[PDB]
Amino acid sequence: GQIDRRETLSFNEQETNKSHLFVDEGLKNYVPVNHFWDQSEPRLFVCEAVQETPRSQPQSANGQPQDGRAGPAADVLILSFFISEEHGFLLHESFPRPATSHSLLGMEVPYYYFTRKPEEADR
Amino acid sequence: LDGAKMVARFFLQLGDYGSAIQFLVMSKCNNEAFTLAQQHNKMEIYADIIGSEDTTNEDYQSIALYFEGEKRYLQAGKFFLLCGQYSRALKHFLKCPSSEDNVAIEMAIETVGQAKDELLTNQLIDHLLGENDGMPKDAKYLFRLYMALKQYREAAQTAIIIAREEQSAGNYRNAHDVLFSMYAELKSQKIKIPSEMATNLMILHSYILVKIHVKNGDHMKGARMLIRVANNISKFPSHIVPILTSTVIECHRAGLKNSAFSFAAMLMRPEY
């Protein structure tokens, strides 16, 4: 959840400035996979992040679905940001990718764009 | 780590390899240090810098295996000794050619002294007593091995042998200096001094003090030291009549005329 900053206009491999402005401990298990900017708003940005599984998988004592043992969270998160020289990175939104949606395709206001399942369009 | 690499790059541009090598500990780039210290033959400086918390016996071993690959058996021996591989260290010290044999024997003595192993000890004693090469070595090395093993009474007996030889030769200062280096050690430890060693050293130092007192014009202390040396004249077989003649003269100068007369009556014997 950290933001680093580094400088190399002159040749450098620098130490980070560190800011702790991100409070959301829910992101620790997510990895970004797709990203986009608004075609009209240069301050506005979005990223799709997947919840990656460890290399080999355990099981529970009871016959539950293996990590779906508990209540819901996002298969994949969509995070949107306002980015500025005066205020840094501000989380504009966080939401689950819709259950009818297979990936983030883009963004241009008023809309994020997603790829729909042909499993559901015929219903 | 990376700010420290810039400081390394700056000293590499200035050409100070000694300062540049520290950053291979401080920025943890240890294998570039090993190879740089190898290329400039500064391997002891790298091994001393390696005294930091970042490091391992596998560093001293990788250094030892490098010198073993160079067939530098003395240096390989030294880094196996620092790694704690006493059998390999001794086997390398014993495999040294005869041009390094003194330093290799001193380090083999140190290796056996640190190891305390009876097989390695007997292997080195068999080497010092020549049963592997058809020659014993100077008694100074058996003495130094007994000291390295802390066999201090056996070392003391060997020091008395080396001293009695030097007394017979008239080298009273060398016999003194050997017995003294052993007496001081036996006194620094909690160990029995031989009554012969104490008696001999005392007698030898009394003879050295004759020169000091007679030079300083103290005919009394000079004469009284000469009286003790003369009461033990058999320990000075190379200087008997000079010592007794000096004893008479200094006793007469001191007003010890009965002592002067007793050593004059001794000098009047047909043997002197």
UniProtKB/Swiss-Prot annotation, chain A:
Transmembrane segments: none annotated. Coiled coil: none annotated. It comes from the Eukaryota. It is found in: Cytoplasm, Cytoskeleton, Cilium basal body; Cytoplasm, Cytoskeleton, Microtubule organizing center, Centrosome; Cell projection, Cilium. Component of the IFT complex A (IFT-A). IFT-A complex is divided into a core subcomplex composed of IFT122:IFT140:WDR19 which is associated with TULP3 and a peripheral subcomplex composed of IFT43:WDR35:TTC21B. Interacts (via C-terminal region) with IFT122 (via C-terminal region). Interacts with TTC25. Interacts with TTC21A. It is linked to Short-rib thoracic dysplasia 9 with or without polydactyly: A form of short-rib thoracic dysplasia, a group of autosomal recessive ciliopathies that are characterized by a constricted thoracic cage, short ribs, shortened tubular bones, and a 'trident' appearance of the acetabular roof. Polydactyly is variably present. Non-skeletal involvement can include cleft lip/palate as well as anomalies of major organs such as the brain, eye, heart, kidneys, liver, pancreas, intestines, and genitalia. Retinitis pigmentosa 80: A retinal dystrophy belonging to the group of pigmentary retinopathies. Retinitis pigmentosa is characterized by retinal pigment deposits visible on fundus examination and primary loss of rod photoreceptor cells followed by secondary loss of cone photoreceptors. Patients typically have night vision blindness and loss of midperipheral visual field. As their condition progresses, they lose their far peripheral visual field and eventually central vision as well. RP80 inheritance is autosomal recessive. Component of the IFT complex A (IFT-A), a complex required for retrograde ciliary transport and entry into cilia of G protein-coupled receptors (GPCRs). Plays a pivotal role in proper development and function of ciliated cells through its role in ciliogenesis and/or cilium maintenance. Required for the development and maintenance of the outer segments of rod and cone photoreceptor cells. Plays a role in maintenance and the delivery of opsin to the outer segment of photoreceptor cells. This is Intraflagellar transport protein 140 homolog.
Swiss-Prot record, chain B:
Induction: By androgenic hormones. Expression increased 3-fold in an androgen-stimulated androgen-sensitive prostate adenocarcinoma cell line compared with androgen-deprived cells. TPR repeats lie at residues 1-34, 70-103. It comes from the Eukaryota. Some isoforms are tissue-specific. Highly expressed in the prostate. Lower expression in the cerebellum, pituitary gland, fetal lung, and pancreas. In normal prostate, expressed in both basal and luminal epithelial cells. No expression detected in fibromuscular stromal cells, endothelial cells, or infiltrating lymphocytes. Uniformed expression in prostate adenocarcinoma cells. Transmembrane segments: none annotated. It is found in: Cell projection, Cilium; Cytoplasm, Cytoskeleton, Cilium basal body; Cell projection, Cilium, Photoreceptor outer segment; Cell projection, Cilium, Flagellum. Component of the IFT complex A (IFT-A) complex. IFT-A complex is divided into a core subcomplex composed of IFT122:IFT140:WDR19 which is associated with TULP3 and a peripheral subcomplex composed of IFT43:WDR35:TTC21B. Interacts (via C-terminal region) with IFT122 (via C-terminal region). Interacts with BBS1. Interacts with TTC25. As component of the IFT complex A (IFT-A), a complex required for retrograde ciliary transport and entry into cilia of G protein-coupled receptors (GPCRs), it is involved in cilia function and/or assembly. Essential for functional IFT-A assembly and ciliary entry of GPCRs. Associates with the BBSome complex to mediate ciliary transport. It is linked to Cranioectodermal dysplasia 4: A disorder primarily characterized by craniofacial, skeletal and ectodermal abnormalities. Clinical features include craniosynostosis, narrow rib cage, short limbs, brachydactyly, hypoplastic and widely spaced teeth, sparse hair, skin laxity and abnormal nails. Nephronophthisis leading to progressive renal failure, hepatic fibrosis, heart defects, and retinitis pigmentosa have also been described. This is WD repeat-containing protein 19. The chain holds residues 951 to 1222 of 1342 of the full protein.
